[PDB]
Design a binder for these strands. Sequence first.
RNA 1: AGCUGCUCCCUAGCAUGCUACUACCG
RNA 2: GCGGUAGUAGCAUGCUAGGGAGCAG
Lengths: 72, 49, 404
Amino acid sequence: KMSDVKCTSVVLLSVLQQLRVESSSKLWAQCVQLHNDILLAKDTTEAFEKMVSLLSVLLSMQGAVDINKLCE
Amino acid sequence: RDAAMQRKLEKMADQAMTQMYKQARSEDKRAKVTSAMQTMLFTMLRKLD
Amino acid sequence: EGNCDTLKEILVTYNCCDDDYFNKKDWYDFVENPDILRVYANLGERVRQALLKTVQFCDAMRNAGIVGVLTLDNQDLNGNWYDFGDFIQTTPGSGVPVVDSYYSLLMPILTLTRALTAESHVDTDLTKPYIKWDLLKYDFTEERLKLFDRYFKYWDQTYHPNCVNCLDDRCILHCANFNVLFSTVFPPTSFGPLVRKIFVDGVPFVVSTGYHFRELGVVHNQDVNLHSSRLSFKELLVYAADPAMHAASGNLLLDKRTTCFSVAALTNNVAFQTVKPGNFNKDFYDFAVSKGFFKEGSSVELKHFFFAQDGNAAISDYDYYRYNLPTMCDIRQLLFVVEVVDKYFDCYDGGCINANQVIVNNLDKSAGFPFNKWGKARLYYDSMSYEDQDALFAYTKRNVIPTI
RNA sequence: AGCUGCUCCCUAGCAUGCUACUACCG
RNA sequence: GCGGUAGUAGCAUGCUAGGGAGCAG
Ligand SMILES: [Zn+2]
Ligand SMILES: [Zn+2]
């Protein structure tokens, strides 16, 4: 169950990086630290907190058309 | 003899041709790089004198 | 660290720290708690005074005409000597002390406690300003000899301040050991390449003739020719690899991110390089999961990942060179350890080989700076004949080429 | 964008080696 | 009937050259 969230955080940081988010050093530092801290977690309840904090970065900007990719 | 021998004449002539092709290109790239580094050396001193 | 009782007692008896320091668990460590250096360097002056008084004692013994062996355990931490039970008496003016086990055993403590730090102070007063050395002076050869004659006076071996005049390799080790200590007194802007203005085709270049080293002293190139007409490939290579014209012609730099001495900024803006996260191979993960892997509470779980890094990752990691201090080794023991170590390498054979016998696997690897603007190693291994490379090799036996 | 060391896989060329069978002589 | 060279097809080894990938310090 924690391996699930670790691989998901890998995919999330890769998407964020593809969206040119490392053009702003503050944001990229925040996301990088959240990612490396998720990968080193050792109890699945902190990982989900930092995952919601990390996904908020993608939900912020409007570059990914969310209503389309949510066709379920 | 004279129909299998010259089947190697073309072999060795063509490999000699390709080797001297590649030597010519490798002797052009040397000139290109020395021109480049000479340009660098001479443009770098035009900032310090 | 289990029983360091006398070290604690010594450290607090002379007010280097106070007993509540030793509850900071990890006080002894060097890379965690790198402040223990400041509390060791507070014993520096007791050691300096000990050295001065041992020179005084050696002189008194020489004049009065006494022969004996000085050992460390016959000198209290003030400096005073005692225990004269094995000295013998000869004619005055011809006594002789024996300082070999003393100095060589003591040597590693002279750079831990930074004992000579009071010599870059205006008189040798820790209460006075620093000596303001001249900025263009790079050859402190007489100060090294004066320091040697002040502290290690009766150490009977010849000390060559510049190891260019050494007799073998053990002499090189012996003299570089002392240079390692004495070089912590001089200014750190006087070490490095020694540039000089030459002329080629009536145009002036600035190029390094030889380098000054902390361990080897001053070294001068042997084939330095002012006034040239044109440069061959080899000379272009040795003038484009030098840091002289790159650093002489760039902006000055003050980088407060590191403690390492920063020279120049080769261009107008600093570059921050990042590291990306790895790619996920979802098919293999699904397949592994479908066969009972990664269930909670199992023995094998995933701990090797691709960690990502932000901008301050190259310099924040380069800054780990702050862990390299100027260590001065015990020489009478290193000169035996080196013989045994070399005996471990007795069943091999080596020597020089010509440029037509080297083997280079993978010629598609980068060529360093600044050569990586124009190609890989293949371009520089094809552009040089087997005589340009041999000229280069036989050139570096008489000259010093600093690189980047 | 480094220096090495080991291992698997694919392709090419050459000579050597090996073997079969065909042509010429002894 | 056999010795010698010249062939093709097949086979193995070894060595060079070229490319791809994996691990270790
Ligand atoms: Zn010497
Ligand atoms: Zn040699």
